[PDB]
Amino acid sequence: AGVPFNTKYPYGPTSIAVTAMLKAEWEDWKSKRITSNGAGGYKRVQRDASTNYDTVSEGMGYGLLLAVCFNEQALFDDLYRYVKSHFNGNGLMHWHIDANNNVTSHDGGDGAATDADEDIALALIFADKQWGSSGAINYGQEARTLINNLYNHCVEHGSYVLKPGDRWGGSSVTNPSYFAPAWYKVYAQYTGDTRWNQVADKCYQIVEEVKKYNNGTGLVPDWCTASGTPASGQSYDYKYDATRYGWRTAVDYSWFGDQRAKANCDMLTKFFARDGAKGIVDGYTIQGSKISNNHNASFIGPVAAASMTGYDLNFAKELYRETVAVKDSEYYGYYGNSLRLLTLLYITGNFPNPLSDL
Ligand SMILES: [Cl-]
Ligand SMILES: [Cl-]
Ligand SMILES: [Cl-]
Ligand SMILES: [Cl-]
Ligand SMILES: [Cl-]
Ligand SMILES: [Cl-]
Ligand SMILES: [Cl-]
Ligand SMILES: [Hg+2]
Ligand SMILES: [Hg+2]
Ligand SMILES: [Hg+2]
Ligand SMILES: [Hg+2]
Ligand SMILES: [Hg+2]
Ligand SMILES: [Hg+2]
């Protein structure tokens, strides 16, 4: 079960590359990121020294996606027990918890962050399909409950706009890096709730609006309104949020053959081909202007993911090599190195649709 899946994506390349390397990188990530300290009897994904080993719900999502793909059931279950120990009044995880297991003050730590719970829900579907739900945790039941909570609290019911939190945002402000059409199609097929297809379509419509303002680069902003225009007081640049877009959105092409995903990801990949793999930096305006110049793991792997849609498979190979080569030092070892491992799973053929023949 799990890595190596030995599956072939139905569209695009099977891999742009490995199994031994992935397992070694997983053992390293697990050693550094997983702890029982401050985990309430369970396990949690901690951030790094730069934020004093706190936990964010997104990190729980990453850890569950990784743990199921690496066939780590006992660990998955303990991570999920920590998540459940932090569901808020809406059934969505508190977004920010300190190292002592207290929800944080002054930053809306009680509220949830949609991208985290979307990943947690997808990971639960994988767990159901890979291990079955008759054991200690009924993964399928937990997934259905979470998906229902996501739809009820995190989707505008008329427009289908994805909200960034359960108690704020929507058409006046949301986050393109949270957009996950392939996840939504899986939710629709797994649960039978077809409304998730309209949520996916709305994400593509937003990206189409953003094309009016991104000067043909394929870049997306960290935050924007439903008109694809700046969200007040929030970054409109392609920075540490937006970088996840190429990862989440290329998957719809590989799993479902979505031509909108390919058209968009080809644009993004083509933009990065201007400077090449070594030239990727950690901040651009959406018109392409560099605003930061660090070359790190938060930005390389997602471009490798976008490259899966086929703009240039030779460049894709170079991006794979760069993704492997650039690993962040440990003081800042949480975010980039997590995206690196997630994207490495995808671009090596080890992130199959959980509803497919595994
Ligand atoms: Cl997963
Ligand atoms: Cl993953
Ligand atoms: Cl949206
Ligand atoms: Cl949320
Ligand atoms: Cl949406
Ligand atoms: Cl939007
Ligand atoms: Cl896309
Ligand atoms: Hg995975
Ligand atoms: Hg997975
Ligand atoms: Hg939410
Ligand atoms: Hg959306
Ligand atoms: Hg937007
Ligand atoms: Hg895309």
Nearest to 293 by CA among 303, 274, 280, 304: 280
Token pair in block for residue 102: 């207290």
Find the catalytic residue in 25, 48, 54, 58: 58
Neighbours of 110 (CB within 10 A): 16
Q: How far is CA 156 from CA 70, 109, 138, 174, 286, in A?
A: 35, 22, 29, 11, 26
Q: Which amino acid is at 300?
A: I
Measured between alpha carbons, how far is 86 from 327 in angstroms, rounded to an integer? 31
Strands 44-45 and 34-35, by their bridges, are antiparallel
Starting from the CA of residue 124, give the closest ligand: 1
Q: Which amino acid is at 272?
A: F
Q: Which amino acid is at 337?
A: N
Nearest to 356 by CA among 11, 2, 10: 10
SS (HEC) of 334-356: CHHHHHHHHHHHHHCCCCCCCCC
Starting from the CA of residue 306, give the closest ligand: 13
Crossing angle between the packed helical segments 181-191 and 114-131, to the nearest 10 degrees: 50
Torsion sign over Cα 66, 129, 1, 305: negative
Residue with tokens 């894709």: 316
Measured between alpha carbons, how far is 207 from 205 in angstroms, rounded to an integer? 5
Q: Does the active-site annotation cover 115?
A: yes
Strands 96-97 and 34-35, by their bridges, are unpaired
Please tell me whether residue 97 adopts helix, strand or coil conformation: strand
Dihedral angle of Cα 236, 238, 240, 243, to the nearest 10 degrees: 130
Nearest to 294 by CA among 243, 249, 344, 343: 243
Find the catalytic residue in 25, 115, 117, 282: 115
Say if CB 184 and CB 197 are below 8 A apart.
Answer: yes
DSSP assignment of 3-55: SS-----SSS-S----HHHHHHHHHHHHHHHEE-TTSTTS-EE---GGGTT-E
Say if CB 339 and CB 302 are below 8 A apart.
Answer: yes
Nearest to 165 by CA among 205, 110, 105: 110
Distance from Cα 28 to the centre of ligand 3, integer Å: 35
Measured between alpha carbons, how far is 350 from 192 in angstroms, rounded to an integer? 26
Nearest to 190 by CA among 157, 160, 151: 151
Alpha-helix residue ranges (DSSP H) falling in 55-113: 57-69, 73-84
Nearest to 66 by CA among 135, 126, 134, 145: 126
CB-based contacts of 218, cutoff 8 Å, min separation 6: 264, 265, 266, 267, 268, 269, 270, 271, 306
Residue with tokens 């994904």: 45
Nearest to 161 by CA among 218, 206, 209: 206
Nearest to 256 by CA among 353, 346, 351: 353
Q: Which amino acid is at 168?
A: W
CA 146, distance to chain mean position in Å, is: 17
Distance from Cα 330 to the centre of ligand 3, integer Å: 34
Residue 192's φ and ψ, nearest 5 degrees, are 90, 0
CB pairs under 8 A, 24+ apart, for 187-192?
Answer: 187/121, 187/147, 187/150, 189/355, 190/125, 190/143, 190/147, 190/355, 191/144, 191/147, 191/148
Percent of the chain that is helix, strand, coil (3-state, to 5) = 50, 5, 45
Say if CB 105 and CB 97 are below 8 A apart.
Answer: no
Measured between alpha carbons, how far is 288 from 295 in angstroms, rounded to an integer? 16
Nearest to 170 by CA among 225, 116, 93: 225
Q: What is the CATH number of the domain that holds 25?
A: 1.50.10.10
What was the structure determination method? X-ray
* Domains of the chain: total: 1
Distance from Cα 177 to the centre of ligand 5, integer Å: 12
Say if CB 192 and CB 186 are below 8 A apart.
Answer: no
Distance from Cα 175 to the centre of ligand 12, integer Å: 6
- For the chain, the residues before each gap (C–N > 2.5 Å) are 17
**What domain range is 311 assigned to?**
1-358
**In angstroms, what is the resolution?**
1.0
Starting from the CA of residue 338, give the closest ligand: 2
CB-based contacts of 316, cutoff 8 Å, min separation 6: 13, 16, 269, 304, 307, 308, 310, 347
Measured between alpha carbons, how far is 192 from 107 in angstroms, rounded to an integer? 36
